[PDB]
């Protein structure tokens with residue numbers, strides 16, 4: 001009934017390098033937690049492998065073209081199967097990675113983005129979300145501090 005993408009972006013909207021995350025910002029991941037819990041989460045098979053354990057309290061739906069390899073989650077073969085597998089919920093969280101984010105952006109009505117002031121070379125990037133289609137409805141800047149080496153910004157965008 002409603003799809004959101006939730007993603008932490010560095011410069012160039014880098015989200016993934018060597019299939020990891022080199023921007024140790026704990027308030028950046030504590031932001032993922034306030035926004036994803038009790039909502040179903042959709043992710044691609046690579047993002048599933050990097051969490052290594054379902055997100056608790058939540059239907060975990062993992063897109064892959066091949067049979068599943070973990071009974072603790074729900075395996076689906078298409079974007080529409082992934083959505084249906086989430087049930088009748090007010091909001092579905094799409095949590096990556098690159099390929100899954102791109103497929104779900106046209107279906108999304110909300111984006112929850114952390115922008116981190118960090119240079120990381122990056123093979124994988126968040127999809128280009130046109131400003132004409134998205135409106136910033138929340139935005140809070142934070143300088144680097146004791147826990148965060150990087151300056152960062154939590155943002156919430158709603159589809160126009």
Ligand SMILES: NC(=O)c1ccc[n+]([C@@H]2O[C@H](COP(=O)([O-])OP(=O)(O)OC[C@H]3O[C@@H](n4cnc5c(N)ncnc54)[C@H](OP(=O)(O)O)[C@@H]3O)[C@@H](O)[C@H]2O)c1
Pocket residue numbers: 006007008009014015016017018019020021043044045046047048050063064065066076077078079095096097098099100101103124
């Ligand atoms: N910073 C962030 O916000 C964020 C979010 C998550 C992860 N990441 C990074 O993003 C990268 C991962 O993204 P990725 O693109 O590498 O892999 P992914 O998007 O996590 O999932 C890729 C895999 O999902 C499956 N898949 C996706 N769409 C499908 C579809 N429509 N039908 C069937 N199967 C489908 C395929 O698995 P098969 O090959 O089995 O078909 C595909 O190989 C990593 O670098 C990760 O660290 C960052």
Ligand SMILES: Nc1nc(=O)c2nc(CNc3ccc(C(=O)N[C@@H](CCC(=O)O)C(=O)O)cc3)cnc2[nH]1
Pocket residue numbers: 006007008028029030031032033047050051055056095096112113114
């Ligand atoms: N805002 C935001 N920040 C992120 O770091 C992020 N990461 C992903 C995909 N990658 C990951 C990697 C690790 C964990 C993770 O370990 N989180 C656990 C514990 C809570 C925490 O560590 O913050 C979880 O319960 O989801 C989640 C997503 C998707 N959306 C995001 N969104």
